[model samples]
Target chain A: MDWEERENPKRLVKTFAFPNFREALDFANRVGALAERENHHPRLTVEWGRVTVEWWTHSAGGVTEKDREMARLTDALL
Target chain B: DWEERENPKRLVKTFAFPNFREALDFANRVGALAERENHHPRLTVEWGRVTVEWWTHSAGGVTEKDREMARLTDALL
Candidate 1:
């Protein structure tokens, strides 16, 4: 639900925010693990209160249906 | 370097963009600069906003150095 589509490089981006650093860091770590298990890594930037996740098929050179589906699956992690 | 803080002990701030692409772009720039400066800061790039936090791992808290680096970080915008 917390996601958007971008056209420049074509990415499905989402930002999951938390109340504090500890929570954000914990979520970021979990997302990192999920990325590993799925074998698709997004750029995860962890700050004081949020982690932004960007999904793109770089080899394909744009966003794909695969990315959208993965994004849908990622929402389950929430 | 001189923003009012919810947590006065830490240099924490947010930068907002009009879209996801801009925020993600800014985050990458921040990442590159942080790496070159050798002062890593925590950055969260969201839908239309990016939050940044600067604190020293050695001190385990905020300091003048963090504030200075924060000002430098802001210049990228």
Candidate 2:
């Protein structure tokens, strides 16, 4: 699953609700940890109410099944 | 213009406005075309809303194929 996440840049999205900017940034840090652990990362958008995360395997230059799995796992985080 | 979009993942957008089954079916087609072309796109679905993103695999940027693929995708529809 680790390499799989990095193989195809199939991005996944995770939306998190944070009480404040500090908490939102913390969530971002957690997501980064997962990305580093798997060697795969995502585009992160943070706001007052929520943080939206988008991930894709930019390897073959597109999305892949691996990305979908990551999205699922991201969902599981919440 | 196009190059700008490509330089920095120049993401493009167009709304397909397909209904539930409609968008779902179209999405499946995208999946197939991607396999055929080996050019997959990041897909976002909020019920009827569908967003597709194409970028470079190596540089983490967008490419001509990304643009071409997008046109071909529209044409296919």
Candidate 3:
């Protein structure tokens, strides 16, 4: 999985690219569904041809093992 | 009037809110609207703002549908 670990909030971030807006939105929606199933939501930024996903535990104020696991699962969705 | 963007021809606007929760909530509302209309828009939600870009992917540009969606999005706030 290609992701960057960021500070300030300590989250794993990754951007998935697509050919167009429709495909990018579709992938973002899939990630949203996965988050709902896991009961852990991430900050998603959907753009024209790209979707950036950041996984962090908000209550904990940082990334956790669960965030890493979710990041992996998000990569699998591609 | 919303900002008209090039390269993809989209109508872009940023909605400001009090906090992250409010911004996220507004983004979800836009998502609900998208689902109801079967027209999706790119939403970037942050600490106190949600940037929405409306465009028709099939048409590859901003169209009447996108304009309508943009108006509806403004109505949402």
Candidate 4:
């Protein structure tokens, strides 16, 4: 629900803030592993105290129900 | 030296390598430095490039620490 929907790329984007880099990177890695397990990857940008995640179906050329579900799963990482 | 960006003043530089693996390794090394210093930068690692941006959010802009980290980041290459 916190994710923003973009039309240009048809993706769901969200930025999660952290207290420091270590935690941000840790969250990013966990999301990476989750993506690998699901066989669906998102663009993860890990910053000093934040991580911006974008989810969409590349092969489908747009966001899908699966992406929404994954976005929820990603939120659960926190 | 690195380029300065506004909107949230920060220092940024992009290091280019031959492949993704090298770029990723370099990014990881930068991450290590950040961990040691307890100061971090936003790292964007792509196919053959790693872009590093340093700034202090608490300070509201780039500071002495950012500059120092930028220099050390260059040395990491």
Candidate 5:
């Protein structure tokens, strides 16, 4: 629910900040597993203390109904 | 290292964990050990898994430090 959505690039983005690397890495692993289940992968930028998740459809070149659902599911994770 | 492979003769092992959180928690300990020893390893953390590879970069091939570090890491498990 607390994420970034845009119409220009049509992307759904969210950044999760952690106090340390372990927390960030664990969150990234959870996100990766969830994405694998849906078969819709997102761009994940993992850092020492933070992770950024972006969801969008490559084929459609923008956000779609699927992306909306995916975004909602990702929000559920946090 | 005890385990062996090509590419500068490194040792690698994949540790299995019950879940991602546990794997990440263990990985942080390994990282701290590496920092304290000043010998680094390549760490790939995934869901329920963390792969660690040890190689002595300066002189190439595994060294005694690498062996000791690997031993210590295994001990942690």
Candidate 6:
């Protein structure tokens, strides 16, 4: 069930979060499935307490409209 | 060079899209990137998005290899 949120299609946002490596790993698992279905990918980094995800169409050299939709969906999932 | 994206150490993240073909194509690229680096990441495809997870087992989960592979992946879009 991932179609509730309206897709942004283009947003370059960053988040400051608190979680462990294992938890980060867990969250990534949740988001990973969602990403697979849509095929829109984001640049992701996982740290000790915070994990950051950047969505951009490398082919386009920037975040595409799809990135926003994916971001919003991720927000809901997280 | 990809420091701008922070890093990629055992990553698990998702990307949502409009349809299946687009999603499949993107996931395929991810596969290609991982293989090219000889560093593979697990990717799960779903309804409107795909999620990817990567870890450098040789370094016991995460390492500079993860970062290097991630940088290469960033170019995959």
Interface RMSD (Cα, Å) for model 2:
13.8
Model 2, C-alpha of B68: deviation from truth (Å): 1.2
TM-score (all chains, Cα) for each model: 0.54, 0.44, 0.62, 0.71, 0.52, 0.43
**Best model number under DockQ:** 4
Off by over 4 Å in 6: A1-11, B1-77
How far off is each candidate at the interface, as Cα RMSD in Å? 7.0, 13.8, 4.4, 2.9, 5.8, 8.4
TM-score of 5: 0.52
Model 4, range A1-78, lDDT digits (tens) per residue? 589998877999998889988888778777767776776777667887788888998779999999999999998876
When candidate 3 is compared with the true two-chain complex, its DockQ is 0.28
lDDT for each residue of candidate 1 in B1-77, tens digit (9 for 90 to 100): 45545443567788888855566567667766666666667876545677777877777777777877888877886
Clashing pairs in 3: none
- Candidate 2 - CAPRI tier? incorrect
Residue A75's lDDT in candidate 4 = 88
Which window of ten consecutive residues has the lowest lDDT sum in model 1 chain A? A20-29
- Encode model 5's per-residue lDDT on B1-77: one tens digit a residue: 35688877988888888755566667777877776786777666545677777888787788888888899999987
What interface RMSD does candidate 3 have? 4.4
Worst 10 residues of 4 chain B by lDDT: B19-28
Best by TM-score: 4
Clashing pairs in 1: none
Name model 1 segments beyond 4 Å from true: B1-40, B43-63, B67-77
Per-residue lDDT over B1-77 for candidate 3, one digit per residue giving the tens place of the 0 to 100 score:
99999989999999988766566668778877887788889898655678999998898898889999999999986
Ranking by TM-score: 4, 3, 1, 5, 2, 6
Worst 10 residues of 3 chain B by lDDT: B18-27
Which candidate achieves the best lDDT against the true structure?
Answer: 3
- What residue runs in model 3 are displaced by over 4 Å at the alpha carbon? B1-42, B45-69
* lDDT per residue (tens digit) for residues B30-65 in model 2: 556666786656544333445655666666787688
